[PDB]
Amino acid sequence: MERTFVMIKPDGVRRGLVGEILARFERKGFRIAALKLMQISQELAERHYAEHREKPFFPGLVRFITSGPVVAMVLEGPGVVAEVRKMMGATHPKDALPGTIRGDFATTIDENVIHGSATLEDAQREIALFFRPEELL
Amino acid sequence: MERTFVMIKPDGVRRGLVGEILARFERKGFRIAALKLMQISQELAERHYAEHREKPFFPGLVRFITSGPVVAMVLEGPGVVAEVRKMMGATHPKDALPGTIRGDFATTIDENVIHGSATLEDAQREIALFFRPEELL
Amino acid sequence: MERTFVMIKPDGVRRGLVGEILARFERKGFRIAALKLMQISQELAERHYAEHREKPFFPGLVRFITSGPVVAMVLEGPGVVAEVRKMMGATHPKDALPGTIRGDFATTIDENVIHGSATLEDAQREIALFFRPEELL
Amino acid sequence: MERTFVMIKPDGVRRGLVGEILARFERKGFRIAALKLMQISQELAERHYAEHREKPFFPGLVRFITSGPVVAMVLEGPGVVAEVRKMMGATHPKDALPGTIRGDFATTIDENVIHGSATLEDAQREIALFFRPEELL
Amino acid sequence: MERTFVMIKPDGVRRGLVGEILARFERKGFRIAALKLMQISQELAERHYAEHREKPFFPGLVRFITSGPVVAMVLEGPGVVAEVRKMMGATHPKDALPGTIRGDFATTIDENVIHGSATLEDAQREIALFFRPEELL
Amino acid sequence: MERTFVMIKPDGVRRGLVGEILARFERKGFRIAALKLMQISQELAERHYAEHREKPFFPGLVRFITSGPVVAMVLEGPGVVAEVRKMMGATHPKDALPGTIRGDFATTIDENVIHGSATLEDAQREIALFFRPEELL
Ligand SMILES: Nc1nc2c(ncn2[C@@H]2O[C@H](COP(=O)(O)OP(=O)(O)O)[C@@H](O)[C@H]2O)c(=O)[nH]1
Numbered sequence A, B, C, D, E, F: 001m002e003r004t005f006v007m008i009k010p011d012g013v014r015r016g017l018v019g020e021i022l023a024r025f026e027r028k029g030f031r032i033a034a035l036k037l038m039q040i041s042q043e044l045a046e047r048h049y050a051e052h053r054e055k056p057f058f059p060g061l062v063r064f065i066t067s068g069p070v071v072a073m074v075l076e077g078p079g080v081v082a083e084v085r086k087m088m089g090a091t092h093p094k095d096a097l098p099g100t101i102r103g104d105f106a107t108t109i110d111e112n113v114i115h116g117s118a119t120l121e122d123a124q125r126e127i128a129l130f131f132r133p134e135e136l137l
């Protein structure tokens, strides 16, 4: 019952990559435990990126992640956290390999189309912050 | 502007068809105004299929629609209601033509994989019943 | 329960369409009850097209059907016979509609890429002719 | 032998549909006899839509067709003209059936993603107008 | 004329991955020399896994590989043996890279969807054991 | 505005891979700045391969690259040159990884389906040689 948090960023949404991306996770055999379209608020954004509150790129993050609606979801399955990270590819598309989501769909780090939890703790932290308990199935 | 209600029934979600179906609507050019995985409550199911509360197939109709989680969504675009109706194909998969969602994915009427609002009127009602106002973007 | 006979003719196999066509039937929800690559013997071809043994196009009809290996299979499911007929599209690719196998892959009647049993009766006969009983699962 | 003129209009190219549409024609079995990305000149657009020079929608019709680059091509094969017409679907995306190019990708008549010669006569004229003789292979 | 033996395991079959998997090998350009749906018998299973007859996981192998019908095939082409191994990805899906068959479709080692010959000798050994001479084309 | 030169070789063209290949670059987010079907002349071929004029494989190159029409194009985007090289995969298909173009579509070095500029200089050199200034958009 391991699980991870994934977010198709605003760029992934306006480019129409929601279905294709979900399709990869479904054919992979992972379970969709949660899923919803949403608009991240400024305050919520700054919270998710709380640790980087001091970083210089922080403003740019909050601005982009709230530039439009996003699709949040939770996937379940064996080693899903490390597995989804592997499927997504390197954070910067130029280093992501063909076959991965960022390697096949993205070209810039600022708009790398997607995000996945780095660790199980980060997953819990992120799941609690974007989903109400009744939204997990 | 125009909006329609779409639902990938429990079989569609069970069979891992959520992404492929979503992708079709995105490729068509429609916008995802709302989206979420949810378990239909016995109450919600009854208020939805109230039309057939007298029919003898109502018990099973409801049982099925709540047998597993579903994916509700709202599509927005030029005549999105009739277009989605056409894209899903006839209700009974036997009459649905290839290239159509039911015609490509469904095999029996009991499990026709998907539902789309029948008219503008049904759209407003169905959307208000499955979605809280704040969930529409 | 219900079963139909399907054959990806020599052109379909030559053109590397076996997988794509198979995938369509699996996505539709049908079950593969039998499957095999085989070279049609002059005898088998004659017993299959016995109907047109008098016609002047029979010689070429047979020559072609044995010009290369083919993929015979048996699909099983709710009204699989008529459904497969619909999925293949009209015999003459000119009349076949897009989304249909012949409508998407074929260009001429001589090479219509695929054949599917016309009726339950044809299904039983064709299956018994192309398949040894132990090959059905 | 037979040849038809096809054009992925500015919206199709803008939306990144060139490859998917091309792939459909290749899977169908047609041959690419000519292909090129090009910006339609105001002159070329007028000579193409001369038919509607009187209509009041002509100004916008031309403006749009030159609003961005397009992909012109020539398909060759057995009755390629009528087949391509069928594959594109009705002009008005509302009437186009799923599995059809316009039926799967277009949403409005203004931007119907693609154009294909209406008859053999239109084909010859359109090809000669969009292509220099040496460009046909 | 080098060749290898491939088997889409029971899990690959019930999940409907037969077509998609074959499609990858066809678009790759390999030739399908043999292909058939079959039910592996207990004795046959134990033979294929003869070497591991002493291993502890042996019982689990025979049990799973006979849990349902499988699709056996033979592919031909330049360095096809090492190539198909590369396409399949690491034996354990968690180590297989995105783009490979196991990396895109599997999550557990016990049900890694597919098998390919490790060496040419293993190929011959496996081809002789699952195919009759007349089944190779 | 960085850009690279790509050529789908004769084998890629006759195998019908033009659309699929373009589709990968479009979903990647790169821009098609130039595109056209063409027949490379002997002299032109020898020029593009000028440096290898002394090599032993030179004759084989000119012969194959002129064996049929090819599709030339120019792609624009962030680090597109190194990125397209990465997408294409190793020059010899046997070393190209699954997910890349050569790794998924090719089996032999002589017919590795595609070519991309090795450096920016090579891109300019190749763009000038295959496209007239008015063909770049
Ligand atoms: N299996 C089955 N379901 C039926 C039958 N008649 C009606 N239904 C169900 O009743 C519902 C009809 O309501 P409707 O809003 O039209 O649903 P739609 O099929 O999505 O258009 C659908 O969920 C049907 O599947 C029947 O004869 N057999």
Ligand SMILES: Nc1nc2c(ncn2[C@@H]2O[C@H](COP(=O)(O)OP(=O)(O)O)[C@@H](O)[C@H]2O)c(=O)[nH]1
Residues within 6 Å of the ligand: C052, C057, C061, C091, C109, C110, C111, C112, C114, C115, C116
């Ligand atoms: N090329 C061509 N084939 C024909 C013609 N008339 C009949 N046939 C062939 O005869 C066979 C008719 O038998 P049938 O069992 O109906 O095959 P089906 O096309 O798979 O339904 C098919 O293989 C046809 O392709 C014709 O006028 N031209």
Ligand SMILES: Nc1nc2c(ncn2[C@@H]2O[C@H](COP(=O)(O)OP(=O)(O)O)[C@@H](O)[C@H]2O)c(=O)[nH]1
Residues within 6 Å of the ligand: D052, D057, D061, D091, D109, D110, D111, D112, D114, D115, D116
């Ligand atoms: N938006 C819009 N376009 C129209 C209308 N009537 C004609 N047209 C355009 O006029 C052209 C008709 O020429 P035609 O050669 O038939 O183009 P086709 O749509 O590719 O078959 C098409 O580009 C149409 O989109 C209309 O009522 N609305």
